[PDB]
Structures are given as C-alpha cells and as structure tokens.
Amino acid sequence: GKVFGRCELAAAMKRHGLDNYRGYSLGNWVCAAKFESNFNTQATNRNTDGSTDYGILQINSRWWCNDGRTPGSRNLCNIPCSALLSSDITASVNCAKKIVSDGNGMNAWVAWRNRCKGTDVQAWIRGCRL
Template sequence: MRSSIVLKAVFVSVLCVAVNGKVFNWCELAKKLKISGLDGYRGYSLPNWICMSFYESRFNTRVVNRNMDKSRDYGIFQINSCWWCNDGKTPRSKNACNVPCSLPLSLLGLLDDDITDDIQCAKHVVRDPNGMKAW
C-alpha cells in the first residue's frame, strides 16, 4: 500500500516537470536555434524564427491553442495537430513530423522544455511548399 502511494507521487512529480515547460528569453532561444541549424535554414534567418516563435507563443513551450477546425497548435512554434503532430484528439491527423503533440501520448511531446523535437518538426514544416507561410 505504502509503495503504491510513493509510486503515484513519483509519477505525478514526473508529469508536473514535463508539463511545466519553459519560457525562453530571447538570447537563450536564439542560441538554441542557431546551434540547431535554423539560422538560414531554407532561406529563413534567425530573426525570422525568433519573430515567429515570439508571435506564436511568446517563447513559451507549454502553449496550446484551439483552432476553429478543432485542431490544436502546440508548443513554442505552435505546431498544428491536423498536419504535423498527433494529439490523439484531432480526427485524421497527418502527423507528418511523426511526433506526439503532448501528454499523455508521450513525456517527450512538444510542450516540454526540450525543444529539439519542435525544431526538427519546424524544419519539416518549412520544407513544405508553403514554407514559413504555414504559420
């Protein structure tokens, strides 16, 4: 009985850490995006990426927004669940980035403080014919 309570407490603690996400400051995000190869990627400069992520999420990795078509946008780049990620809620999700949008599908979704998967998906999005206009 006691071990089950401890196990539940540990599980809840892990979920809280994953859900908390992170709000980057401008310099910290710029450095992460540059190291990840986004500066100049597909013709989009670092300021393009910084500006887009600011207006989409205010540099906040845990933002989720609902759209009129019942899809949702997730994370720092507001990746859409209809086209790019799977949230388990959006019917007929294409999941082109092959990534979970959020919990409970994975502890490594687009809402955690590790934006590596977000960056990989954003690169996939701009390879689409719409490029940055997808946002």
C-alpha cells in the same frame, strides 16, 4: 515548463541549425516564436475545428503531430504532439524544419506572415551572444 528569453532562444535555435535554414535567417524564427507563443514552451491553443496548436511555434495537430483527438490527422512530423510541449526545443525545431521541407514557406505560421514578414527581423537577435 519554461519561458525562453529572446537571446537564449536564438542561441538554442542556432545550435539546432535554423540560421538560414531554407533561406530564412535566424531572426525570422525568433520573431515567429515571439508572436506565436511569447516564448512559452507549454503554450497551447485549442481550436474549434478540433485541432490544437502546440508549443513554442504553435504547430497544429491536423497535419503535423498526433494528439489522437484531431480529425484528418496526417502526423507528417511523426511525433506525438506532447513532444512539442517540452522544455527542450528539439522536437519543435525538427518539426518546423519538416514543415518547410514539405513545401511550405514560413507563411505556414500566421504570426510570421502578419508580424514578422517585411520587418527588420534582425532586431530579434540584435545584442545577443551567438
């Protein structure tokens, strides 16, 4: 287990190279995590299409990680989906980078597109010690 705080997650994401990764400032990543998972590292969402969204950034099992249950699996991050349910954000950050590297913007995250895009995302790191 673990539920992150806002500033604590920002610091961890910064340590892991996400600030301005492919032109997306740190607050975008924190905002995405807030609305995807509420900062809960063990968040899962089981979909009716046979796929599941895993962890703090709700990465989906059809394209990105292998859970052995999902039709059409591509496993483009080359990881078991269970690695995305850690208390350590390593695997989630590595896979998030790969998603963007593999031709996606942050629009890959529905919560980013609907709740973060266009907003003052710097608010999510304001006040934090980075």
